[PDB]
Amino acid sequence: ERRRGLTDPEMAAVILKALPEAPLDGNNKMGYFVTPRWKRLTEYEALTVYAQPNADWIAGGLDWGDWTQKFHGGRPSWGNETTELRTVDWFKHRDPLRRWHAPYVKDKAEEWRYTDRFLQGYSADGQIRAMNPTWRDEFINRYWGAFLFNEYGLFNAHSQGAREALSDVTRVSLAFWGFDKIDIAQMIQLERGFLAKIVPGFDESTAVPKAEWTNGEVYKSARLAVEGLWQEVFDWNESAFSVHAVYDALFGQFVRREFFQRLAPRFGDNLTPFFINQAQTYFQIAKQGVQDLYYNCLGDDPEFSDYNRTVMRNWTGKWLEPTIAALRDFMGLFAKLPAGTTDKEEITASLYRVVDDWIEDYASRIDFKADRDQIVKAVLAGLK
């Protein structure tokens, strides 16, 4: 049997005998040298800041010298060359929610188990009985299901960023932004799988919503934007900023909040909103981090504010057009709704909510002159 030094009389006595009288240094605070963002250093910061071994030549790095092994050709492991944005210190970023691995999986796990109990309750409660069949069969199955691919693409857009992020704080935020997206895609399928269990004849195969995504008209420009953001952008910041501060903030928010969350309730559907609640909770959580990185740290950088804002305004313009195109094609879905579901007045107000929120939360932060009426009118152009 194994003898442990903490409990074995012989070994412990030897250990105790070697110990000093008191600690050899009174400074018992790990990352004590890290500049805290708040009043006192947090656990999130201590466990995260400076984990990335950058040298001083990547803004804010504490190490020195070149990397030990680079790519064939000479490209650095991490380098300034992977993004247009510049800063005085890449370690400035702080997720306002202070999420390191432990609290992140803790919360997601709570949502998972509660999701399981909710479904167990919903099915036992027979709440499906009053859900409109047309909404369920056409709208949730095909159209909401098609949206899974949008979120999946947005998830995949983060792959390069996971590899190229220039700091630990940014990498952690980025990974969580991406992981929440795949989760949402999976929750859309989970709902379809649930319907297949409680509704005879309902087919959980992704065939239908996939065909809608790849070949339909309503999500045509959406898919084109996603394919672009994911595979045509090689700058990790352009990807993150454009996905979260342009495309998803406008198109995603409209689709999730202004179409499905707003309309599913009119069809006796409290099922889809249960999952959209998670999606919106996740959107608002990421937003805080997106704003901190792009506005507080980059857009407001003491030495590169002007430069960065120029680049971000550039990306906003670049991605605003395909985003509008995405919303415009999506307007086509309203024509497919049963008569009397909505009207142009409600659609218009919903469009303004999304645009106004985007202007206050994102556009205005970098002095991007967005014309609300101009944007709403362009989208309304696609109603039928």
Partner: protein, 512 residues
């Protein structure tokens, strides 16, 4: 009341449709250079979804942090550990931390490389796991700093690590090797070799030695880390499976594997043997025995053997690796100790029992290393008033210490009982020093991949105390060095003790 059986949906039921999530478009391809084609349709072993992944990890965290925060703290477990082990854990936890960290980026790269949704999903879970591991290793140092006998180093390794030479080599195997190169070469360095050959057995061995040395903090955390490793092995296996049916595999796989194998063993062979044998009071097993089982038998034989059906074969450099192994860790500790002022940890000369243990397990140890250590002690290497640093002995005895341009591993050819090979080239106005035929070929074939400045090039003409000072190698009193040549509670060396020695670095290649 109501009607219908309570029903729900699990991970497998959703994962069943995950492969179908990816769709075709012209530019749906990896953003990274690669000689290989990862087959779409490649499947993954673990049928996970994000929510279930979080749940499975959360339960583990619950147990771990519960133990740490309650019982272990009540037991003062952060204190009742052998002084030597408290020091070893500064290096073990922080160096492993960087591998966990770079592994996040590596798997992000692999997620990008994979075209099949399931394969991307497999790499994704590892992305999240490596973040978990980064925070776990960080927590081990956080805990020891908060509750241990010597927080210095544990509390600032992220910046104090930069003063010393051993850190450069760690960056080669667990940072750059994981992310810089063909995605497949990185996967071989990370998963197929790094994790399967070294990390997986090392993590558990570390809990063994820790426990032997009174440390119950490390086993609590490291045993939790090891529960995730199975999925990472699967990712590595899947990498090979994904590229195996393409013509490029026959042409390139085995050389990328051989290069990755050499890369990983070049550092771990001497370093881990050093950390175990010289960083502990109580020993678990001689490293010569351990290395043979881990690398030659377990990995080199069985593990790799399971990949034979995909065209993988034993690294052609395996024989060379075994030959160079035996004395590697002994040769290295001489240098690590000689350069003690550059560390962020405290080191000790082997005591009488250890010298006996070493000789019993490595005949001839005493005649070479033992006598040297005794001479250094006589010269006063432990005493602040001696004015002696072992590096002085190297100079007096014409024993230059070089840094391998490729692996960054320090070596002293004229002294070593191991390899003794040295290759020095001049190219375009710069000289380069190599310690073996494999790394030499790497540089000759890919000089632009290996331009890392060494400690002697950067510190050239600088006086030692000024380097330590600028790089914050001091304890909170702002005068006592973090590093020490002994692990006792007093007679600690100070910056001024170092300054009086007037040790000024020289680039050894300039002798040529």
């Amino acid at each position: 009341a109501a009607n219908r059986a309570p029903t729900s949906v699990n991970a497998q039921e959703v994962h069943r449709w995950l492969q179908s999530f990816n769709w075709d478009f012209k530019n749906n391809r990896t953003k990274y250079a690669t000689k290989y084609k990862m087959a779409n349709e490649t499947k993954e072993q673990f049928k996970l979804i994000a929510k279930e992944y979080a749940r499975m990890e959360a339960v583990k965290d619950e147990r771990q942090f519960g133990s740490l925060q309650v019982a272990l703290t009540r037991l003062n477990a952060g204190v009742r550990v052998h002084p030597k082990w408290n020091e070893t854990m500064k290096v073990v936890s922080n160096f492993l931390e960087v591998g966990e960290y770079n592994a996040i980026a590596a798997t992000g790269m692999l997620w990008d490389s994979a075209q099949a949704a399931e394969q991307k999903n497999g790499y994704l879970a590892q992305v999240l796991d490596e973040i978990r591991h980064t925070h776990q290793c960080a927590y081990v140092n956080y805990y020891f700093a908060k509750n241990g006998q010597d927080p210095a180093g544990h509390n600032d390794a992220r910046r104090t690590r930069t003063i010393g030479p051993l850190w450069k080599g760690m960056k080669r195997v667990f940072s750059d090797g994981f992310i810089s190169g063909d995605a497949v070469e990185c996967s071989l360095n990370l998963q197929l070799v790094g994790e399967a050959c070294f990390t997986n057995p090392l993590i558990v061995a570390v809990t063994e030695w820790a426990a032997a040395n009174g440390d119950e903090i490390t086993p609590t955390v490291f045993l939790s880390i090891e529960t995730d490793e199975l999925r990472h092995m699967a990712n590595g296996y899947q990498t090979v499976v994904s590229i195996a049916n393409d013509p490029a595999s026959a042409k390139y796989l085995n050389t990328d594997l051989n290069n990755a194998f050499w890369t990983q063993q070049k550092y771990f062979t001497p370093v881990l043997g050093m950390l175990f044998e010289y960083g502990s009071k109580f020993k678990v097993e001689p490293w010569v025995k351990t290395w043979d089982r881990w690398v030659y038998e377990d990995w080199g034989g069985i593990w790799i053997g399971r990949l034979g059906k995909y065209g993988v074969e034993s690294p052609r450099s395996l024989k060379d690796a075994k030959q160079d192994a035996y004395w590697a860790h002994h040769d290295l500790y001489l240098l690590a100790y000689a350069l003690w002022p550059t560390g962020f940890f405290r080191l000790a000369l082997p005591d009488q029992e250890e010298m006996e243990w070493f000789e019993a397990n490595y005949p001839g140890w005493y005649d070479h290393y033992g006598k040297i250590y005794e001479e250094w002690r006589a010269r006063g290497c432990e005493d602040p008033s001696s004015g002696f640093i072992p590096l002085m002995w190297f100079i007096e005895n014409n024993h230059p210490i070089y840094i391998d341009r490729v692996s960054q591993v320090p070596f002293c050819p004229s002294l070593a009982k191991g390899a003794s090979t040295l290759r020095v080239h001049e190219y375009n106005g710069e000289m380069h020093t190599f310690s073996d035929q494999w790394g030499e070929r790497m540089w000759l074939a890919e000089p632009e991949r290996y331009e890392c400045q060494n400690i002697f090039e950067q510190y050239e003409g600088r006086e030692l105390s000024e380097v330590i000072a600028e790089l914050h190698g001091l304890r909170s009193d702002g005068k006592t060095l973090i590093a020490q040549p002994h692990v006792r509670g007093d007679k600690l060396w100070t910056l001024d003790d170092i300054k009086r020695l007037n040790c000024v670095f020289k680039n050894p290649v300039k002798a040529f």
